[PDB]
Structure 1
Amino acid sequence: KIRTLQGRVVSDKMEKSIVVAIERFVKHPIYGKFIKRTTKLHVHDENNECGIGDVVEIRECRPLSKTKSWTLVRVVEKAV
């Protein structure tokens, strides 16, 4: 019962870290239409157990660096 977010992975070139393209379904305040405003983050990737195009679940932890504030807990649907 810990607040977590699930999203794709876009880049793995950085050492021991990845990025997550969190996607959501937000309703427009004015026109009342549902859109997809994505959100990018920097997630710690100890042991580099991830890959590009993979679905991951993350967790909010202490800031590891200037842009790092999230860490992963597992990996699911390791599509190639």
Structure 2
Amino acid sequence: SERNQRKVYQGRVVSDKMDKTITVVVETYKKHTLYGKRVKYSKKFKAHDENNQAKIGDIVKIMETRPLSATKRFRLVEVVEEAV
């Protein structure tokens, strides 16, 4: 009996400046109710980096979890592509 699977995203780090955390812009992007054209929206999430293995400009995946603090609900899975 394998337990239920949590929600997963991928995104992009805006800032490193918070202590042991980052914020992450997920750029999934969707169309209207009326005009039908498909527009973009950037959703930045607060996510915990317990190893601090992040950089500004880093494409990263995040998993949802238990609420880590106020506004924090996410953690790292696999830091995919690093900034230059």
- State TM-score, norm by structure 2: 0.89
2-structure distance, mates of 1:19, 1:54: 11
Q: Where in structure 2 are the equivalents of 1:21-36 lying within 5 Å?
A: 21-36=25-40
Matched, 1:7 2:11: yes
Equivalent of residue 40 in structure 1, options 31, 44, 48: 44
In the other structure, the counterpart of 2:63 is 59
Q: How many residues align?
A: 80
Which sections of structure 1, spanning at least 5 residues, go unmatched?
none
Question: Once the two structures are superposed, what CA deviation does each residue of 1:6-56 show, in whole Å capped at 9, x if it has no partner?
Answer: 011000011100000110120111100000011111000111001100000
Q: Which sections of structure 2, spanning at least 5 residues, go unmatched?
A: none
Which contiguous aligned blocks of 4+ residues in structure 1 show a shift greater than 6 angstroms?
A: none
Q: Quick one: percent identity of the two aligned structures? A: 55
Whichever residue aligns with residue 13 of structure 1, its letter is: K
State the Cα RMSD in Å: 1.2
Rg bigger for which structure? 2
The AA in structure 2 aligned to 1:15 is: D
Which is strand-richer, 1 or 2?
A: 2
Match of 2:24 in 1: 20
